[PDB]
Ligand binder design. Structure first.
Ligand SMILES: N[C@@H](Cc1c[nH]c2ccccc12)C(=O)O
Ligand SMILES: N[C@@H](Cc1c[nH]c2ccccc12)C(=O)O
Lengths: 101, 101
């Protein structure tokens, strides 16, 4: 249903915009503690590390599984989503997540 | 383990700070599409609606289940987390999520 998809999209943007405003008001931490579960906070921290290591290029995917405790399916999702991302985002992530050499 | 808890906390803050910076650079939407699954975007949109309706106070919890398709367990989590939240956050959410009367 296109109508239901439109409703889901509007609801998602409401979250995005709410959080934007929370950051501007220094309310982001309490908002994220309200809106997410502990397990989802843990998952998001792990996903940042997966991205950082995929961009770095030192560890193979099976080495990452072993080192981070994340399964191969999880790592593969990360890799495919990173390959699909806009170049501008990948370039920015390389600037922010990796140390200068 | 306190040491592992410290590691999880650091990783979570890295996400929080990454997203802060993404918003400042207008990269928030692509970052959130990279970092979250579709089902997690849907869940976050639904949770904003649950919070909005709990603060409004018009619908009972069983009415919300019926109207939003969310289970009673999900609504109860929302309600308990809202009651636990800092007053300043609740007050701000009332200002932003509800229309002026
Ligand atoms: N956008 C990704 C989210 C994701 C899942 N697992 C990950 C691991 C790392 C980074 C992102 C992810 C997806 O839809 O699959
Ligand atoms: N912080 C809540 C997250 C949550 C789960 N279900 C919800 C419904 C609405 C709002 C928040 C939630 C928790 O840990 O339980």
């Amino acid at each position: 249903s296109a109508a239901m998809a439109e409703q889901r999209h509007q609801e998602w943007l409401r979250f995005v915009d709410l959080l934007k405003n929370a950051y501007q008001n220094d309310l982001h931490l309490p908002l994220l503690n309200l809106m997410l579960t502990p397990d989802e906070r843990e998952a998001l921290g792990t996903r940042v590390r997966i991205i950082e290591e995929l961009l770095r290029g030192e560890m193979s995917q099976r080495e990452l599984k072993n080192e981070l405790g994340a399964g191969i399916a999880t790592i593969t999702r990360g890799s495919n989503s990173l390959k699909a991302a806009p170049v501008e985002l990948r370039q920015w992530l390389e600037e922010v997540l990796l140390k200068s050499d």
